[PDB]
Amino acid sequence: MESYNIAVLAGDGIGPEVMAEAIKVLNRVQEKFGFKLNFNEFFVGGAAIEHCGYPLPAETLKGCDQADAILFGSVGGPKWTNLPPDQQPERGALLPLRKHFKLFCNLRPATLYKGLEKFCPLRADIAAKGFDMVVVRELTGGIYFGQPKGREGDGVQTKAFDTEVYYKYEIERIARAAFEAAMKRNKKVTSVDKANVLQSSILWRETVTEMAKDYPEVTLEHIYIDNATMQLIKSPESFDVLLCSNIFGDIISDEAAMITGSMGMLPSASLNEEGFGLYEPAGGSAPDIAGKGIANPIAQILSAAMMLRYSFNLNEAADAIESAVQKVLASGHRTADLADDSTPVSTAEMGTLITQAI
Amino acid sequence: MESYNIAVLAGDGIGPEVMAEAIKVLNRVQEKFGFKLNFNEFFVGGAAIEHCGYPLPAETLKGCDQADAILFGSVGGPKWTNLPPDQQPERGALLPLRKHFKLFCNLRPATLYKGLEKFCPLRADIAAKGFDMVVVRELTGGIYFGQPKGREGDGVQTKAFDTEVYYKYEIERIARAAFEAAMKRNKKVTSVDKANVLQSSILWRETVTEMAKDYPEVTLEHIYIDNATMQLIKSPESFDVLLCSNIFGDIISDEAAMITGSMGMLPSASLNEEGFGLYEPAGGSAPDIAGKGIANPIAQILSAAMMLRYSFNLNEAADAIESAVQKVLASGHRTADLADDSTPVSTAEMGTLITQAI
């Protein structure tokens, strides 16, 4: 009789669309295995800018505080380009959210599904080898949050700046999260930095290496961010855990999403040291397809399939949604973003096919 | 006939190996096209460390000060991991060289040669659409040179930091180079930033946008760095000029190199406002293969071609090198990096074959 409380935040763009299908798939999971979910929905992002007037209004932050997990869509859109930097949906809501709940550990699992190599935009012989990867991205530190940042001066000497700064304890905790995930997988961690140039990357590399002494079963490799970007295309199969800074993990996880077939595949979990977890798709609000019922809901759906995994240890419920996405796709069903030409289904139609595989 | 004075800084790892082939190609190009190069060789990087105790000896910097152009291989490797940050080949030699000669404009032309699509690691239908773009990368500013940078504190409170800082004049001159490049190509500039988060990217985007008013014949599009990483895989054909910060250009250009088939294919030019140039492969010293005579010399050879073109306007000589490369590849010869189930030619064989095709 487990009754948990989710604070659903849909956001902007394809946010509200794919969020409906995530609920759809859940409700079947609820009455299928035996638990309740009490979905309380709030406004965040540019939506909260004309339904409250502020990207993260007090009410919204309050609902999260009271839930056992936040289900999240995405924010951002061209409508809010021209607000001040601090008051847009990205700096105004999402980055604050992450910092407020100290959600330092970002998990983005990217895998090529059995027999789905058609989706993969790589060459057939590369895609054949398949791949199964988890990006462990430091989420609350680094250049996205560092101080100082701002703009000063005038004219051609106007100067703008951001600070890629890390404190050792921030590196230690995300590194631990990486080695623990590796222990539960294939015992390989690839740490990605630019330690031949950046001072912060030198500290990253040294701390990760120190941390490795508490995990002698894990193989630790170090690679530079520019090389990482080739290796993902050339040998995606050689990766297990990808340990990354905030900005490098941002970059690398989209590349990984693409090689699995689309941005619409990659789910994500953002967890703090307590296990409290926000669950959003890795990608953004996709303005160019927002409002049209064409948008892969898999990433949003599988997110909740991670929420019941990590926030609530309900493995059978999570293994359900996951093998239900595998079966719909195994049957040749589909949204437009994925390769192969055959009448795509809408977001709704993908939501249903999957809710049915439940 | 007066010679041009070429400082040859082959460096570490595969550097000496591929530089030897560039010199062999250049000697034949000199005969066939009537011009004279005076090669003066200098130690740099790890090799200079082993000879002098210094990664950038005063003798080497003198040599470059006295040269008409610099032909550079690559620096760095495992032998030097444990040196103090400022003695290492990369911070101690390459970055200072770029900074000393004010080589703000980095040009990396990535092209998939018509007929070599089996080399491209993208899916065959994607690779069929073609790929021909040039990264225009700001090379002397941004996080790789910003201050403050360093490390402070101790224990878990140790912090390390680097500053991504741009002045408007730095963005203006690199933006201008990208729009001029676009004017000679297909009149599209795609500018890469992270303007939804970074103050420095906001200034980047604003300044590029304002520079575009000077180029009504050119399309300007703005894309986020994480998304750019996907678009290169999904739609390589859509790119013409890719305008990037120092670190973002560093990152994306390795991905561009890989989709042309190998890091070993991508040459580069680094130019200051007076047109003085340093020419080097875009990639590193390849320590995993260094000394085995298997590295692809094409990047170094095409770097020498850019030298002739950009430093000396010997355009016919540079065209011949490019065509000789394409003919050898069309004839089925390939080094081990170029995907094929044939016996690969060595580094020195590839150089000889290119030389004979001049």
Ligand SMILES: NC(=O)c1ccc[n+]([C@@H]2O[C@H](COP(=O)([O-])OP(=O)(O)OC[C@H]3O[C@@H](n4cnc5c(N)ncnc54)[C@H](O)[C@@H]3O)[C@@H](O)[C@H]2O)c1
């Ligand atoms: N998590 C977030 O809230 C977050 C993260 C990234 C970007 N954004 C915001 O999103 C907006 C657009 O940014 P972007 O275009 O660089 O990133 P994006 O991820 O939104 O889109 C990149 C490309 O992938 C496609 N795509 C993304 N999700 C898809 C899905 N579910 N199904 C099918 N296609 C999908 C888009 O159509 C687009 O072509 C911006 O305002 C940005 O600030 C928000």
Ligand SMILES: NC(=O)c1ccc[n+]([C@@H]2O[C@H](COP(=O)([O-])OP(=O)(O)OC[C@H]3O[C@@H](n4cnc5c(N)ncnc54)[C@H](O)[C@@H]3O)[C@@H](O)[C@H]2O)c1
């Ligand atoms: N301009 C420079 O001097 C420069 C630039 C980048 C890296 N580096 C240094 O190079 C060293 C290696 O760095 P890395 O491994 O990240 O980058 P890398 O570019 O040297 O190698 C990346 C991968 O590409 C392969 N590769 C590169 N050039 C090749 C060629 N000519 N033919 C066949 N394969 C090739 C390598 O074998 C490796 O597997 C490091 O010390 C790094 O600091 C130097």
Ligand SMILES: C=C(C)CONC(=O)C(=O)O
């Ligand atoms: C929404 C932002 C603050 C930009 O951050 N971007 C990501 O997390 C991503 O692109 O995955």
Ligand SMILES: C=C(C)CONC(=O)C(=O)O
């Ligand atoms: C050797 C360095 C100073 C690191 O720089 N790396 C690049 O410039 C690249 O990947 O091109």
Ligand SMILES: [Mg+2]
């Ligand atoms: Mg690079």
